[PDB]
Amino acid sequence: DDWRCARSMHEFSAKDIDGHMVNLDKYRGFVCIVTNVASQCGLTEVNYTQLVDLHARYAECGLRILAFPCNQFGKQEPGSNEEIKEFAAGYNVKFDMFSKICVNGDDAHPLWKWMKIQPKGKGILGNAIKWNFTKFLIDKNGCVVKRYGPMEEPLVIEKDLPHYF
Template sequence: MASETSKSIYDFTVKDIKGNDVNLSQYHGKVLLIVNVASECGLTQTNYKELSALYEKYKSQDFEILAFPCNQFGSQEPGTNEEIEQTVCTRFKAEFPVFDKCTVVSISAVEVNGKNAAPIYQFLKNQKGGIFGDGIKWNFTKFLVNKEGKVVDRFAPTTSPLKIEKDLLKLLQSS
């Protein structure tokens, strides 16, 4: 679906790590943290640990983390979906949804920048540009989405997921 005509995150359908279609409208009414992840990045250990802690603490309060594996930065997510799932679930004990690295037959992995950027990332960047423009600079850029599917904030890869907690709480407590 074209990001130009999309009004919320719920207008998108993506593939999960097993290749099944997931209409993001199933997350309507939940606060989302959307993150481009990588298994072999210097930021991986801390981000996955803190993302898992946030998820465990708030998953029962209408909060979801949506992780999108991306190999666009330094080839730091080189594995197959099966290898990524094994790493995320076993090594990092993540329980939040992880999506498909491959989104389109002609694209070898989810791209967040450039002409082959996944539509969901075109939408996210259009909603909340970064300090130095819309481009995503590295793995673990985080987008906070409210219960209506609108992007309300964007956080740099180096921002600790735990530093986002106060913003997350405000959204969870809103009606």
């Protein structure tokens, strides 16, 4: 359980959606939006399109987006990784997709376990991820600086970006 001792997102790794292992220290020096995604959520469209739009506008300034598929909320990500990738490709996604994970419980990916306990990664009423499309703002040092709940559209993050750009 050495995820508990980490101080930065950059101490973790994740399998991307194609199966390649990714050392998240490649995001050192970039501002990151880390989010759990789903294909069959009522807010699937607004989140995917607004994250693609944010990426189109701010990748030039060092913004990156890490999307983690998750099937724990109403079973709204039932597909395989290749199906989820083809679905993201349909929204013209060019940011970083990862393999499907869990975000809550003892099988939760250690990075999400880590994000939930960060001083700014704790949510209103408990740390558990409440639904699809919870967003974390990660700074250039890999620290969590804000958590955004599932009803907050990505464009709500836009005004906090220039503080960390």
